[PDB]
Amino acid sequence: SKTGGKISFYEDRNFLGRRYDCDCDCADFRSYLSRCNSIRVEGGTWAVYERPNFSGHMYILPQGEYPEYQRWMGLNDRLGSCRAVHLSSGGQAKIQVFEKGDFNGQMYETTEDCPSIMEQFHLREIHSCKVVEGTWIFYELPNYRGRQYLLDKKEYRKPVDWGAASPAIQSFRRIVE
Amino acid sequence: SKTGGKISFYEDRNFLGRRYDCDCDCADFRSYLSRCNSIRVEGGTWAVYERPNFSGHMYILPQGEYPEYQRWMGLNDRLGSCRAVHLSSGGQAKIQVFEKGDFNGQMYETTEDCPSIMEQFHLREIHSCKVVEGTWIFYELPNYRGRQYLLDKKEYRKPVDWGAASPAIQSFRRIVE
Amino acid sequence: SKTGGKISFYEDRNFLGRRYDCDCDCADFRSYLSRCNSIRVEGGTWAVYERPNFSGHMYILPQGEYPEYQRWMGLNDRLGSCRAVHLSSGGQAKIQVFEKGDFNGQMYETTEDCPSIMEQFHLREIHSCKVVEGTWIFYELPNYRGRQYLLDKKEYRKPVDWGAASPAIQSFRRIVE
Amino acid sequence: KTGGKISFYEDRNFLGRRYDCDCDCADFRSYLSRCNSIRVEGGTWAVYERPNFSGHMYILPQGEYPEYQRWMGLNDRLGSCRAVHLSSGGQAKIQVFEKGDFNGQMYETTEDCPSIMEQFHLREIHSCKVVEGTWIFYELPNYRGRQYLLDKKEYRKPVDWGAASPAIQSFRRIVE
Amino acid sequence: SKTGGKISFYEDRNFLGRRYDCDCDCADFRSYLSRCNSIRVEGGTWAVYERPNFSGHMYILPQGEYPEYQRWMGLNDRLGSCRAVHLSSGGQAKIQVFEKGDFNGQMYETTEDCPSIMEQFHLREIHSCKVVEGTWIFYELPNYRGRQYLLDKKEYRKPVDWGAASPAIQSFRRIVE
Amino acid sequence: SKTGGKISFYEDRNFLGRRYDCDCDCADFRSYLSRCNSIRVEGGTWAVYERPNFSGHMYILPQGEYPEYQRWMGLNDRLGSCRAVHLSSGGQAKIQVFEKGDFNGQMYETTEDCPSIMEQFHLREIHSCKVVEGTWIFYELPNYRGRQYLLDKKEYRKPVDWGAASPAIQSFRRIVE
Amino acid sequence: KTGGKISFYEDRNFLGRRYDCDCDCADFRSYLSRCNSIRVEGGTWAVYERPNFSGHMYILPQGEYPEYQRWMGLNDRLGSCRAVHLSSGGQAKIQVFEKGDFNGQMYETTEDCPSIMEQFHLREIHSCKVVEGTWIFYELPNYRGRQYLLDKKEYRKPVDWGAASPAIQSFRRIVE
Amino acid sequence: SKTGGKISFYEDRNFLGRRYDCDCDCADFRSYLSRCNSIRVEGGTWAVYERPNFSGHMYILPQGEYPEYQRWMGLNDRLGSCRAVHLSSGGQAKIQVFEKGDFNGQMYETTEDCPSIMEQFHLREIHSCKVVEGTWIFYELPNYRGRQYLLDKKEYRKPVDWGAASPAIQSFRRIVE
């Protein structure tokens, strides 16, 4: 799963026999193993399928050590393909900003970035803000220059709550994983 | 929120001189480094600060290699604390579920896992569903048993749309990583 | 090659700036890098793309250390997706066996494995062979047991070139790994 | 070769004295008395009962072997191991022609081609078919221009692979 | 205070079932594990807690492997937060230094480094010294130059006792790790 | 230095030539290298000596990258032995406990552990405490059983400051690195 | 063998296409055109100008080589590498006698000894001297009891090594 | 062997309980483990001691997985110090060269290297040799340049058994690594 995601199939109970290892999708492994009867998932979370090419019944596995096929709700040692469930769509973040403080004045909501809040919003300062999802950097200047502040919480009622000595912030941007 | 992640500070530019490694949050390394002119971030995103105990001008450094401080928009060479940003992958994950097909009849919206549809809600079948944020697993039988189906951020107009030949679904989970 | 490849993209020349790493295919990394001017392939062979979703122009990158976008024949630094390339190990070996030593008798070829060459091909013993490519195991009996001998890509007139003098073999196998 | 390593235990269930190898060892009977379990983290390995690769011999893929009977072994008696360099590459073949997928013009040599016609007399290659391996076309010779990718298959048009003109002057093999 | 360190929690005993890795402080993993019956601590010392946000009954686990919770004197199987203990190696480090031999004459006690004896104190030579806590470096010339001598937690009755043929010492540092 | 401590010597400036690596003391390496002209210290802090068997002039090196022998204050490429400076003597911790709270009543000081504070100190409860060095676990019962509390700070004025709902603590113990 | 790996770069200063080996490769001219830098992370390696170990050949310890002239190389032309298994062990010899450090009783065979006198007729060994390697004495035979350790040296008393009685019945070699 | 050894001590049988790891000698680990009933040597060969400061009874432990104190012949679980053992690589090779092929001429031996065998031994060419043990390099000239050939532990009557037919060599070297 690209952050250490890997999964290892074994042909005997309790991690024995031949072992086959997979870092990505793999649409068939019936060549390497005849049967899979235990799995260790060291990284990530896997769709694992009975036949090859992602066919048959599907069982899914996160990090952990599975010594018997029944403790993934399996029904045979028949497995043939696996797909990594790659994580949530990054498109989940959102933020609310206010003109006056303590959530007063005109308030504007956005799931995207903001180069010049003067231009897209016609506000000079920002005195309070709720983060509803995600994490955000506040910039004192347009174009993501200047003093930086990190909004890793939920709500903020005046600029010092994000560690600013002034309401001068003029652009903001989301971080992603 | 807890995997590999590492930051390295060098006294001199181009990754030279005394070196200090932070693999989690450090509130004062001024006794190891007198200065920092170059950073390497092998993993994660970091907030570094000019002063210790996370104060002063702060910069965010993603993975990357920064041979002088002007590459992290640094003002000068004084840094003193480092904090690693957590970027919750377990954000919101909503799902809607209906008792009739094509989103008719009774319906619920949940944020959380459910070992028994007919316990927590009063639906025996499930015939349509909306996934709003995240990706979920549908189970044939109560308490996360039976055949599993996997449901990404889509809409599902009939049970056949998530694979299932039937509407016999009586538990569901959200994914986490 | 196998699934252990890994490629890393840098935003500046000489392996500097923000860095993104793949070990599997990435539909988009435009939400991670503004540009790309150096690449480091640590494993595998990769196909890289100007645009997300594998559109645009395509450059092929083998293992090595690429300090500039012109050292992979690129037209500029706009890349947006990548995807590892495979080398057909499910179709990378055949064999030619021979009833009489030094290629007398009649010539029997396959690219599959053979359980009981009696059952499949109607010979009692194998006296010669040339292997097209691949590595192969002979066993004494049909069920793949008994003494085993292995055969790298070459030409053996008499059973002495592999590990015995008895002609007794009744099963053979290509090995994928 | 890449990341291969094998471990021999004098006792079953991966206990006792343990001796590790990642290339070949012609005799390790001095380090190891018996051998009743093996771990193979990477690669496939040939294991010989006696030193310098003699005696009965077993193959073992990666996997975990707690008894000698699990690798079909006869006793606990083994003393040398060779790693098997499975032939990587060597199957890339080709074929070309200046008209549409017909045995008219031909060319079947498994080297490289910096020039459409210097490395083999031909104006422009109009279609092709590999017999194994993966090959790369280059819109202009000495391997410049638009890169294009072909897997072991048959082609019948410069649009059966993604391109515009039949403009094609170079062909290179891949190995991994 | 910042090197490798890792803790692993298993849903089931003897290191089995779903697994969760903490390499720095985690304030709530109840959404990854419903339980924990076995822990592995590869690095560092940890505080784990029954409830999230570091509350409830707490246990300290050093490096080790704990196959049931009764091995960490656990009361039951509910754990929810993990915090890594910092054990400051840069504790106190005092040194005394005299202008005469055998601890006679003017003398100072310091906790901190000193680029010039004859700047901060008014001694040209240094002829005796006591190391109270820690280990220090003596330098021939001011500003951490010249020949270095190394001084562990000992007493030093004359300059010859720390190696030096002379008393020409005019800077010193403490060690840090 | 046993927590990842390693050092690498190179026979050319800027990390080139033959490289020799050392995890422990090494009383000679003039066989492997003729000259050392750059060093990378990846772990720990090293005494490094001019001749073999820890002889000649001594230079010491912490973590960092030293491309020229002069930037460790060297004078030649002559080096022959190295010793790891292993960290501070663990014997630095100390703690003060009080009968009444806010540092009242009889007060007892100890640099060692305490099995039964009733027996060694004849105190039933402990209502306040200063840690002067080290880190300590408080036990509600004798013999290090019972509820655990962690004193990772400096001073504490009533039991809840170490998270206790009661003054019932009866043994305490130091942690070491 | 243990942890050895070598990297060949087509370009100087560790750039270009790069091919890695940790066992031997008989020919890698297909993966690598030229070679102008090498990195050797582990082990010592023999590098041959031509395939299957032919041509001129250079040794390279671990180290970092940015030019071919840094390994005394003649060109950029090389195509195969063997890892050199430096002989580990093989020098442990011995000698024993029942009186005090005198060539009276003798015994010089470089195997093991579970029994003071069955594996070689002698009551108790009273002193000894190894000619190389490191050996271990055992207070009682079949290698039980107080262990004692001898480096390549000469001894002249069961107190020249740390023990009480001259009680000594077993001797075992070490290899690492 | 070399410096890459590593041994790990467990307080319970079957590699359980608290664990301490060494890669270099440890005068005391009684401040870390109450007991020891299983050991894991991952590299090297180790000498372990009942008491700190290498006193008490001594057990020698080669690479392997020791689940019980009786499987290293111990008398109980009180161990308190350890220290790696070396294998004399500064005295592990000699050679015997020969003026005339197949051991005619007179017999010249050393265990050192030889720069100019002309200067040292008064021969123009080397026609035979047997190597006692060790690996050796012949060069064409005295300064260790020219063509090189290597020689593993064996017996070569004519210069054909090593890589040439010309007798021209004037320098040779034992290699330590």
CSV table of N, CA, C and O in Angstrom, one decimal, chain E residues 45-83:
chain,number,residue,atom,x,y,z
E,45,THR,N,10.8,2.5,25.9
E,45,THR,CA,9.9,2.2,26.9
E,45,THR,C,8.5,2.9,26.7
E,45,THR,O,8.5,4.1,26.3
E,46,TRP,N,7.4,2.3,27.0
E,46,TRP,CA,6.1,2.8,26.7
E,46,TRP,C,5.3,2.8,27.9
E,46,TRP,O,5.4,2.0,28.9
E,47,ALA,N,4.4,3.8,27.9
E,47,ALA,CA,3.2,3.9,28.8
E,47,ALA,C,2.0,3.6,27.9
E,47,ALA,O,1.8,4.3,26.9
E,48,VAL,N,1.2,2.6,28.3
E,48,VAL,CA,0.0,2.3,27.6
E,48,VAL,C,-1.1,2.6,28.7
E,48,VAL,O,-0.9,2.6,29.9
E,49,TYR,N,-2.4,3.0,28.2
E,49,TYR,CA,-3.5,3.2,29.0
E,49,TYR,C,-4.7,2.5,28.6
E,49,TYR,O,-5.0,2.3,27.4
E,50,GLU,N,-5.6,2.2,29.6
E,50,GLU,CA,-6.9,1.5,29.4
E,50,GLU,C,-7.8,2.4,28.5
E,50,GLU,O,-8.3,1.9,27.5
E,51,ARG,N,-7.9,3.7,28.8
E,51,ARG,CA,-8.8,4.6,28.1
E,51,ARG,C,-8.0,5.5,27.2
E,51,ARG,O,-6.8,5.6,27.3
E,52,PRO,N,-8.6,6.1,26.2
E,52,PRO,CA,-7.9,7.0,25.3
E,52,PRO,C,-7.5,8.3,25.9
E,52,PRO,O,-7.9,8.6,27.1
E,53,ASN,N,-6.9,9.2,25.2
E,53,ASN,CA,-6.2,10.4,25.7
E,53,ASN,C,-5.6,10.2,27.1
E,53,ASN,O,-6.0,10.8,28.1
E,54,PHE,N,-4.8,9.2,27.1
E,54,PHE,CA,-3.8,8.9,28.2
E,54,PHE,C,-4.5,9.0,29.5
E,54,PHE,O,-4.1,9.8,30.4
E,55,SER,N,-5.5,8.1,29.8
E,55,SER,CA,-6.2,8.1,31.0
E,55,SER,C,-6.5,6.7,31.4
E,55,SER,O,-6.5,5.7,30.7
E,56,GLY,N,-6.9,6.6,32.7
E,56,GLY,CA,-7.2,5.3,33.3
E,56,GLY,C,-6.0,4.6,33.9
E,56,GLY,O,-5.0,5.3,34.3
E,57,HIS,N,-6.1,3.3,34.1
E,57,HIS,CA,-5.0,2.5,34.6
E,57,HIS,C,-3.9,2.5,33.5
E,57,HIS,O,-4.2,2.4,32.3
E,58,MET,N,-2.7,2.8,34.0
E,58,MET,CA,-1.6,2.8,33.0
E,58,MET,C,-0.5,1.8,33.4
E,58,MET,O,-0.2,1.5,34.6
E,59,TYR,N,0.1,1.2,32.3
E,59,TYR,CA,1.2,0.3,32.5
E,59,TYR,C,2.4,0.8,31.7
E,59,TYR,O,2.3,1.3,30.6
E,60,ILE,N,3.6,0.5,32.3
E,60,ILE,CA,4.9,0.7,31.6
E,60,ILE,C,5.4,-0.6,31.1
E,60,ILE,O,5.6,-1.6,31.8
E,61,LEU,N,5.6,-0.6,29.8
E,61,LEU,CA,6.2,-1.8,29.1
E,61,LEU,C,7.6,-1.4,28.5
E,61,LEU,O,7.7,-0.6,27.6
E,62,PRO,N,8.7,-1.9,29.1
E,62,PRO,CA,10.0,-1.9,28.4
E,62,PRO,C,10.0,-2.7,27.1
E,62,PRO,O,9.1,-3.5,26.8
E,63,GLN,N,11.2,-2.7,26.4
E,63,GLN,CA,11.4,-3.7,25.4
E,63,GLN,C,11.2,-5.1,26.0
E,63,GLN,O,11.5,-5.4,27.1
E,64,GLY,N,10.6,-5.9,25.1
E,64,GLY,CA,10.1,-7.2,25.6
E,64,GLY,C,9.0,-7.7,24.7
E,64,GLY,O,8.5,-6.9,23.8
E,65,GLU,N,8.5,-8.8,25.0
E,65,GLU,CA,7.4,-9.5,24.3
E,65,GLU,C,6.5,-10.0,25.3
E,65,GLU,O,6.9,-10.8,26.2
E,66,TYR,N,5.2,-9.6,25.3
E,66,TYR,CA,4.2,-9.9,26.3
E,66,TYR,C,3.0,-10.6,25.7
E,66,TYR,O,2.2,-10.0,25.1
E,67,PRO,N,2.9,-12.0,25.9
E,67,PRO,CA,2.0,-12.7,25.1
E,67,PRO,C,0.5,-12.7,25.7
E,67,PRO,O,-0.4,-13.0,24.9
E,68,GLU,N,0.4,-12.3,26.9
E,68,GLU,CA,-1.0,-12.0,27.5
E,68,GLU,C,-0.8,-10.8,28.3
E,68,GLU,O,0.3,-10.3,28.6
E,69,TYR,N,-2.0,-10.2,28.6
E,69,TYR,CA,-1.9,-8.9,29.3
E,69,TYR,C,-1.5,-9.1,30.8
E,69,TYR,O,-1.0,-8.2,31.4
E,70,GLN,N,-1.7,-10.3,31.4
E,70,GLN,CA,-1.2,-10.6,32.7
E,70,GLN,C,0.4,-10.5,32.8
E,70,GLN,O,0.9,-10.3,33.9
E,71,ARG,N,1.1,-10.5,31.6
E,71,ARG,CA,2.5,-10.3,31.6
E,71,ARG,C,2.9,-8.8,31.7
E,71,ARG,O,4.1,-8.5,32.2
E,72,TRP,N,2.1,-7.9,31.4
E,72,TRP,CA,2.3,-6.5,31.7
E,72,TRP,C,1.4,-6.1,33.0
E,72,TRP,O,1.0,-4.9,33.1
E,73,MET,N,1.2,-7.0,33.9
E,73,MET,CA,0.4,-6.8,35.1
E,73,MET,C,-0.9,-6.2,34.7
E,73,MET,O,-1.6,-5.5,35.5
E,74,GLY,N,-1.3,-6.4,33.4
E,74,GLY,CA,-2.6,-5.8,33.0
E,74,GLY,C,-3.7,-6.3,33.8
E,74,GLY,O,-3.7,-7.4,34.4
E,75,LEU,N,-4.7,-5.4,34.0
E,75,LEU,CA,-6.0,-5.9,34.6
E,75,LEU,C,-6.9,-6.6,33.6
E,75,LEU,O,-7.2,-7.8,33.8
E,76,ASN,N,-7.2,-6.0,32.5
E,76,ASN,CA,-8.0,-6.6,31.4
E,76,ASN,C,-7.4,-6.3,30.1
E,76,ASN,O,-6.2,-6.1,29.9
E,77,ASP,N,-8.2,-6.4,29.0
E,77,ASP,CA,-7.8,-6.3,27.6
E,77,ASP,C,-8.2,-4.9,27.0
E,77,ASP,O,-7.9,-4.7,25.8
E,78,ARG,N,-8.7,-4.0,27.8
E,78,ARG,CA,-8.9,-2.7,27.2
E,78,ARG,C,-7.7,-1.8,27.3
E,78,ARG,O,-7.2,-1.5,28.5
E,79,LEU,N,-7.2,-1.4,26.2
E,79,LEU,CA,-6.1,-0.3,26.1
E,79,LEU,C,-6.6,0.7,25.0
E,79,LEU,O,-7.3,0.3,24.1
E,80,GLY,N,-6.1,1.9,25.1
E,80,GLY,CA,-6.6,2.9,24.2
E,80,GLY,C,-5.6,4.0,23.7
E,80,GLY,O,-5.8,4.6,22.7
E,81,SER,N,-4.6,4.3,24.6
E,81,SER,CA,-3.6,5.3,24.2
E,81,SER,C,-2.2,4.7,24.5
E,81,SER,O,-2.1,3.8,25.3
E,82,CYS,N,-1.2,5.3,23.9
E,82,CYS,CA,0.2,4.9,24.1
E,82,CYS,C,1.0,6.2,23.9
E,82,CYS,O,0.8,7.0,23.1
E,83,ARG,N,2.0,6.2,24.8
E,83,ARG,CA,2.9,7.4,25.0
E,83,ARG,C,4.2,6.7,25.2
E,83,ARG,O,4.4,5.8,26.0
